[PDB]
Amino acid sequence: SKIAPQCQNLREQVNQLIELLRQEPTLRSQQDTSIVETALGKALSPRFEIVFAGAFSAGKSMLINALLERELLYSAEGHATGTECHIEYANANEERVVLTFLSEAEIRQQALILAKYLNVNVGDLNINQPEAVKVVSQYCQKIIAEEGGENKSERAKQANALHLLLIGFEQNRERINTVQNSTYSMDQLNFSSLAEAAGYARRGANSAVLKRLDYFCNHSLLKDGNVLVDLPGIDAPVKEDAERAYRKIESPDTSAVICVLKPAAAGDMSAEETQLLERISKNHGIRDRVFYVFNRIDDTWYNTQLRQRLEGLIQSQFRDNSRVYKTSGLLGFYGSQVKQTNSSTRFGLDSIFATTIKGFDGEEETPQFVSEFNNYCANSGKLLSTAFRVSVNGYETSNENYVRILSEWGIPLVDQLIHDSGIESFRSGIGLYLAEEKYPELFATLANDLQPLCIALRQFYLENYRQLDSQPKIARNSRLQSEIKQKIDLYQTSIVSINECLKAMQIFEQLP
Amino acid sequence: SKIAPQCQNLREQVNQLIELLRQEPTLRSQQDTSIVETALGKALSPRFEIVFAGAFSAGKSMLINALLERELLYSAEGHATGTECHIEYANANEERVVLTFLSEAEIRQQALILAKYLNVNVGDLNINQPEAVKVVSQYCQKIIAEEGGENKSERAKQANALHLLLIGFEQNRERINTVQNSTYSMDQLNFSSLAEAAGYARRGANSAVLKRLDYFCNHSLLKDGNVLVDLPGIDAPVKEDAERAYRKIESPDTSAVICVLKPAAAGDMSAEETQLLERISKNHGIRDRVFYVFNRIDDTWYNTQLRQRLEGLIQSQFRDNSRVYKTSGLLGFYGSQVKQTNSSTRFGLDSIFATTIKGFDGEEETPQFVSEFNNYCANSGKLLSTAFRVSVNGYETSNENYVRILSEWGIPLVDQLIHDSGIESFRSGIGLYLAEEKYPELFATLANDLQPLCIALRQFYLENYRQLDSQPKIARNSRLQSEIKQKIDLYQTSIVSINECLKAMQIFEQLP
Numbered sequence A, B: 001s002k003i004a005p006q007c008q009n010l011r012e013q014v015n016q017l018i019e020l021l022r023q024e025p026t027l028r029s030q031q032d033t034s035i036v037e038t039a040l041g042k043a044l045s046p047r048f049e050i051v052f053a054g055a056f057s058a059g060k061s062m063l064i065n066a067l068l069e070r071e072l073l074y075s076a077e078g079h080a081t082g083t084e085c086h087i088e089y090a091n092a093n094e095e096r097v098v099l100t101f102l103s104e105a106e107i108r109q110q111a112l113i114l115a116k117y118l119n120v121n122v123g124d125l126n127i128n129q130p131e132a133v134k135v136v137s138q139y140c141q142k143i144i145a146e147e148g149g150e151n152k153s154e155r156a157k158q159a160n161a162l163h164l165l166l167i168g169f170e171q172n173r174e175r176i177n178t179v180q181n182s183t184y185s186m187d188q189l190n191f192s193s194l195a196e197a198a199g200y201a202r203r204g205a206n207s208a209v210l211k212r213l214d215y216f217c218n219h220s221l222l223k224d225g226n227v228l229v230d231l232p233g234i235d236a237p238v239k240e241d242a243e244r245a246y247r248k249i250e251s252p253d254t255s256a257v258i259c260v261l262k263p264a265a266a267g268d269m270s271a272e273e274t275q276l277l278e279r280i281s282k283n284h285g286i287r288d289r290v291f292y293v294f295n296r297i298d299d300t301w302y303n304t305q306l307r308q309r310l311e312g313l314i315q316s317q318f319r320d321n322s323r324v325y326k327t328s329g330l331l332g333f334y335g336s337q338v339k340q341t342n343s344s345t346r347f348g349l350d351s352i353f354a355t356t357i358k359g360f361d362g363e364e365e366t367p368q369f370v371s372e373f374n375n376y377c378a379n380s381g382k383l384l385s386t387a388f389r390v391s392v393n394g395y396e397t398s399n400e401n402y403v404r405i406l407s408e409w410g411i412p413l414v415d416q417l418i419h420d421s422g423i424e425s426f427r428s429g430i431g432l433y434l435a436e437e438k439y440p441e442l443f444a445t446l447a448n449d450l451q452p453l454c455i456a457l458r459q460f461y462l463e464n465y466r467q468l469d470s471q472p473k474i475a476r477n478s479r480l481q482s483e484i485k486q487k488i489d490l491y492q493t494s495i496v497s498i499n500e501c502l503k504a505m506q507i508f509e510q511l512p
């Protein structure tokens, strides 16, 4: 939210106060000013980066489409998110894709590390020679064949990673700078047809040449300076980009987390996810920020056992009932999309699934939404309590069973679907938290971390001057005492300004 | 299969031949007789242990019930297989459960290792004092609380493991011997009600006090000396019993493997599974034996993307079309069970699901078979090509939708289900391989590994004696030469006996 003028001046006042503390070695050794300086850095809030770190194929990229109620991020079964990605606010005329390339220096360093692990006996990887690129990729292919297949061996996986990296550079030597990280853009006319297509081709390929794709977008969730960050599934075979995902989660460059967790589908927390929770716990202050989201909830509608397991898990480990949500992004995002559709469209079988509908032979094949919409109308869910006499016939195709239903019960029934999936709870909760809670919470935590610091300074000063007053040229002594006393008057002025900022923010845990 | 009398004598002949080789340091250094001795050890075949190593919740225990067409192994979502388990042939009067307990020495060693990792500052873990057991379990509970929940921390997981181990010993100090591994049994009257119930209570609890449960059973797949071994999911939180699973897979105590793989559900091979494939590859000879089984295939009926991914995976990595099978044990095993049921039963809603049907509140809740039977009759599958006008209604309960269908289309339709799931291919293929292929294959591999050994010996002997004959007391020299020549005559006799055994076995790669 926008900054009141006292809160605008507060940066100077807090830096000045920290300098007044640093002046005395006793307080400098006693107190970790860096913590307050970091909390101030957050309070300045040029960004507030929300990280969707979560398990492999847990649907986190889908879930960001659910929060945006728009298709942006590419999403498929298996790995489809092999690169860090950002979404940021921009106005209608400003919507664009901005890439960011690794340099030759980085690509060469990575290729050298891979070759060393592979025991690829090659000298300087002068990939500026297509001949050398050919030789090294032939080595990689030979290794992959001798390992016997792309996942027969860790050596095969790393060889395939090197092979993809080399092919990426060969495709991109026009754009990769030797030392700089080149900036390159896709521009919006038909955002989906041109722009997002050129996006996923540089994303869903998992091409390691990029380290960032930025999307600029109008959706109001972005507008207040909040940046949605997506990350690969931390069970990625490219171990370094998973470790960089940990870097992005851990480093103060970010502080928000959404964890996307399998237990509804998996049945229990995986060691992959407990490692993530430990790494979150290690950060000094994130744990208050962090949310849990259970995804693929729909599988609990079908099985008693998974629903019992998940209930037991939530009531055991996850009492934080304001920070836990159940969702199925696949049903919510398409549900909202389906509400836009029309009967003449065939309810999104054109203009939504039009790519997926064309099968391996190009004939009509069922998009997953339809098979787990029919599995929601028949067989499962709560329609028993509605008026909807929905029924699904095994002598009609999977699409006819959908077109018929939506052609008569449709627009009412889609709201029953959405409110069963619960994305309207999740998007509501984040929409509330990111505007209303987060700005006060960042100022409240700043004031809270300042409170021991200010108490320590007040105690040190008052105990010194009570010691001096209890014990027993005056113009010199008074010049020193009045200079430090005027520093204390500045401390009082700054704390008055901070308390006025907090009062304007309706924060009452004010400083002494 | 039963052993012909030449093949019965072959053990002596092969040991004797190996001694004739060992006599000469040149061959002893040149050749690894231990390989042939191991192949002979397999050829003697007092056991042939088949190991169902495969991913966490990949359904391998279910799949063994599918191979047996009987319930034996406990099975649930999440971990439900926390212990090594064996199934062996016995006759109708002999069917029994045989446990095998860890000793006090092992339990104490494990508890000490855990306490050391936990930094539990306790002396000798004299768990013979219930007071000490109480103190250590209170430490474990306090640690788990400070970590903040059973999967908040690796330290929490290991504390919970120690807590379960201690409670297990407290429950079992009547039966645990201090140094010996106690043997204890459950005996069959109502095998399911008494025996298998007392089984899962010592299995599905994941109580670490046991290291083996043996089941003795009549099913013909066991009868020819083949022992089915089940193992925990190698992504177990108890790292040691996973490493022991690796021990059981790797060590010559076993040689057969069935890998049970998620990619239909997961979308790709996990690093968990590639580690397993590498560990299999490291064993010197298993790789010819090993089978791949894709399980949770049914999810590919619903999604085009998973079916395409799995087809691409199989055609890339898994050309071994006689060693790859697609299955869904959940549909096959219950399908065969359902065929036994009757309409008055309500087709297994009594006498099969009678435990599961009683919900958390005891009311009727849907067993997973019914929800992914209705999802197979409606919406998915191939019934389009059958006569069956099956339909599923959203205004009727999940059980009424099942009872109605089976009450009119039932017994025909269950065969369409089973032959879609394909368990009748898998059980047929293993049934053929374990009798017909395996016994010849073990003798053929024994003969093949003998063939370099016999060629090396023949070359060494003939090159020595051609050297001597090409160069230039005779009773002494001839006593030596004729003794070694009679050893060569014994070699000829043994190789004649082996070739006669192979001929009786219709094996034609015979020795010179």
Ligand SMILES: Nc1nc2c(ncn2[C@@H]2O[C@H](COP(=O)(O)OP(=O)(O)NP(=O)(O)O)[C@@H](O)[C@H]2O)c(=O)[nH]1
Pocket: A055, A056, A057, A058, A059, A060, A061, A062, A063, A074, A075, A076, A077, A078, A079, A080, A081, A082, A231, A232, A233, A234, A295, A296, A297, A298, A327, A328, A329, A330, A331, A368, A372
């Ligand atoms: N039934 C169902 N399927 C879901 C749900 N969420 C995700 N999926 C499945 O998973 C896909 C999501 O793809 P994607 O967003 O790339 O998943 P991801 O977690 O980002 N994969 P990665 O680990 O590579 O980052 C969907 O297309 C669908 O197949 C859900 O709530 N229900």
Ligand SMILES: Nc1nc2c(ncn2[C@@H]2O[C@H](COP(=O)(O)OP(=O)(O)NP(=O)(O)O)[C@@H](O)[C@H]2O)c(=O)[nH]1
Pocket: B055, B056, B057, B058, B059, B060, B061, B062, B063, B074, B075, B076, B077, B078, B079, B080, B081, B082, B231, B232, B233, B234, B295, B296, B297, B298, B327, B328, B329, B330, B331, B368, B372
């Ligand atoms: N739909 C479906 N579910 C299956 C299938 N196979 C297994 N499951 C699910 O997984 C359960 C199998 O439990 P279990 O045999 O204990 O699995 P596991 O792989 O042995 N678990 P663990 O890793 O602890 O050894 C079934 O009850 C069902 O919920 C399948 O083919 N289809």
Ligand SMILES: [Mg+2]
Pocket: A057, A060, A061, A075, A079, A080, A081, A232, A233
């Ligand atoms: Mg993804």
Ligand SMILES: [Mg+2]
Pocket: B057, B060, B061, B075, B079, B080, B081, B232, B233
């Ligand atoms: Mg299991």
